[PDB]
Design a binder for this molecule. Structure first.
Ligand SMILES: CCCOP(=O)(O)OC[C@H]1O[C@@H](n2cnc3c(N)ncnc32)[C@H](O)[C@@H]1O
Length: 652
């Protein structure tokens, strides 16, 4: 029938298509969608945003969405080949003016940040007025340290609301902020501090996350032992517990800010001035974004992928150390002038009901999280969500990895009660903003499909064995883009050759995401996993999401990862690392029978070749702080944080 199949699901294809629900049709007093009600309404608007006549739309959106000090004249220029991408180059603006000042001038008492503290009872709303005053104070403090336009400033802050003020204070004066996930080791912090050559660092005395203390200042003290360029450290008093402070070098955030005025002017920034550096986990890649294209891209995707409306309370549960936090906690939502959540805790603290307690307390209208969090709460059962309201939500988003249809259905049935649109949002740090996602008022969804590309995104499928584009539908290969879009990364910091070689060289003429992808018979796009994770069994090229979505169809399975290994008879062979739910009786099911049933399930939905050669039952998989599964690690172990010793021990 079809060359390309959906990710394995227990639900039949003919009953697995989800039209926008009533909460996304302008019924029950909910806002009418910006784009709707159907696929044709998405195509009609999307077509204006790509092709040789798309400048007019982008020019209008740029002028309508952002406040400019100087207008631009050129809409776009440059290209992939040399990495000289330009958007609105003659224009000037300020990101902090667009995220704070203009909204403060309209409604200063409107809530900018819902600060959901690690302890629920310490939460509160932070108005645009308060956020802007604190941003301006910090901006004044940085100027007193001699920080100039174009200087780098490192940020090592946990998920307290002042992290937005630190970002936006750097943006306000034209400094380039480099945020580092709070909790990274002293060595990882040091490597990123030295690479951006910053002279100022911002951090807390301590962090709080899940009832546990992050010793940020002690970590900072170990790191700066090898960072000779850092002269000033601004220390936010988050807990007030005793930490070491170095005379002269270190200062308390509150005592410095109390000396400064509560307003600070905005540096007028060129469209292409660098806004930030964001390192991704070879050596750390300093991904650089400029100002206007990135801001416009986060503003537009937030408005259209989540159907944001003025009074919305947008809840992105990620961390600001991640691009997801950059684009859909701070810049995107604050640019649109709505309320945004800064969530300091974990999904299971104090109990696995926290997400849903949070939604009903604040009456959030959109929730945006990661598959790893969705599969975690699935592992915990349905009683932490069944007895909540959750009816203020209209849209639920998933980001970071392919979402298995099992998880997609749990999300849809319990978080949304079958009344929310599910937006599977595909993008990368290097894309700046969401690349492929359903528009929730228009697109009928399929579990595990990102569906259709966003405005400005013209994507295609290349057969990696020929280097040539595959025309039509029902094709599979590697995902590429044909043209720059406004928010694409502009370089890798002081390493432009790595930028060109990684993204622009593999398929000359295109941008190479690094993900395997398929376009099915309806034109829906499926992102199936990293190209490096593809497993080649006797010609059959298997993707990680494919096999993992099959394995999770078996009862008792909480999460899985599969990697390839050298096999003489099949080229490569599939090896599966399976995580079971805690209450699964492993003594009653003889493990060899479990592994046998798992092979049968994979052979049924995928084919005989896809059955794992070996299956390792483990307690947890190696994962990053954002929740990406570390298949490279498992692949290396099967070929010769504490969860890494368990994997090596179970494989020997
Ligand atoms: C955007 C937040 C994550 O940014 P990062 O730069 O950390 O990682 C990007 C990678 O995450 C995966 N990825 C992310 N989102 C999806 C997604 N929605 N579906 C399938 N794969 C995904 C894709 O493999 C991609 O190359």
């Amino acid at each position: 029938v079809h060359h390309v199949h959906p990710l394995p699901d227990s639900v039949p294809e003919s009953e697995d298509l989800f039209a926008p629900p009533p909460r996304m049709q302008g019924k029950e007093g909910r806002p009418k969608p910006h784009i709707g009600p159907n696929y044709e309404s998405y195509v009609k608007e999307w077509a204006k945003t790509v092709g040789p006549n798309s400048d007019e739309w982008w020019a209008a959106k740029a002028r309508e969405t952002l406040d400019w000090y100087d207008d631009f004249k050129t809409v776009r220029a440059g290209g992939f080949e040399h990495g000289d991408v330009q958007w609105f180059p003659e224009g000037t603006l300020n990101a902090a003016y667009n995220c704070l000042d203009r909204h403060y001038y309209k409604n200063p008492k409107k809530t900018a940040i819902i600060y959901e503290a690690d302890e629920p009872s310490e939460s509160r709303e932070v108005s645009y007025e308060e956020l802007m005053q604190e941003t301006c104070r910090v901006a004044n403090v940085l100027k007193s340290y001699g920080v100039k336009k174009g200087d780098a400033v490192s940020i090592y802050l946990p998920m307290t609301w002042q992290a937005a003020a630190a970002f936006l204070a750097c943006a306000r004066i034209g400094a380039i902020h480099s945020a580092v996930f709070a909790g990274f080791s002293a060595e990882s912090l040091r490597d990123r501090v030295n690479d951006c050559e910053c002279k100022v660092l911002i951090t807390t005395d301590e962090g709080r996350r899940g009832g546990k203390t992050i010793a940020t200042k002690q970590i900072v003290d170990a790191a700066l032992q090898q960072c000779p360029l850092v002269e000033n450290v601004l220390v936010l008093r988050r807990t007030g517990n005793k930490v070491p402070m170095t005379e002269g070098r270190d200062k308390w955030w509150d005592e410095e800010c109390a000396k400064m005025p509560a307003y600070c002017p905005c540096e007028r920034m060129a469209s292409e001035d660098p806004l930030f550096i964001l390192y991704t986990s070879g050596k750390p890649k300093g991904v650089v974004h400029s100002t206007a294209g990135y801001l416009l891209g986060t503003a537009l995707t937030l408005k259209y992928v989540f159907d944001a409306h003025p009074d919305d309370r947008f809840a992105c549960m990620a961390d600001i150390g991640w691009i997801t936090g950059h684009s859909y906690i701070i810049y995107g939502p604050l640019a649109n002038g709505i309320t945004t959540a800064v969530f300091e805790s974990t999904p299971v603290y104090p109990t696995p009901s926290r997400y849903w307690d949070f939604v009903d307390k604040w009456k959030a209208t959109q929730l945006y999280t990661a598959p790893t969090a969705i599969r975690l709460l699935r592992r915990m059962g349905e009683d932490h969500v069944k007895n909540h309201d959750l009816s203020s939500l209209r849209v639920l988003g998933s980001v970071g990895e392919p979402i298995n249809p099992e998880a997609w259905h749990w999300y849809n049935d319990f978080a949304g009660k079958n009344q929310c649109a599910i937006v599977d949002t595909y993008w990368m740090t290097e894309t700046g903003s969401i690349s492929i996602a359903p528009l929730p008022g228009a697109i009928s969804t399929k579990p595990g499909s990102a569906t259709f590309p966003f405005f400005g995104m013209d994507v295609d499928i290349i057969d990696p064995q020929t280097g040539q584009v595959l025309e039509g539908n029902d094709v599979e290969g590697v995902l590429v883009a044909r043209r720059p879009w406004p928010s694409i990364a502009r370089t890798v910091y002081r390493d432009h050759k790595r930028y060109l070689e990684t993204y622009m060289k593999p398929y000359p003429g295109y941008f190479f995401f690094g993900d395997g992808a398929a376009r099915d018979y309806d034109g829906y796009m499926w992102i199936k996993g990293r190209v490096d994770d593809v497993i080649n069994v006797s010609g059959h090229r298997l993707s990680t999401a494919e096999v993992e979505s099959a394995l999770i169809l078996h009862k008792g399975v909480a999460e899985t990862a599969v990697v390839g290994c050298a096999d003489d008879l099949t080229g490569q062979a599939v090896y599966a690392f399976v995580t079971m739910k805690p209450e699964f009786d492993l003594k009653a099911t003889k493990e060899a029978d479990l592994s046998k049933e798992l092979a049968i399930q994979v052979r049924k939905v995928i084919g005989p070749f896809a059955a794992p050669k070996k299956i390792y039952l483990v307690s947890d998989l190696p994962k990053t702080r954002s929740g990406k599964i570390m298949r490279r690690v498992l692949r290396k172990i099967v070929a010769g944080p504490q969860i890494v010793e368990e994997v090596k021990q179970k494989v020997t």
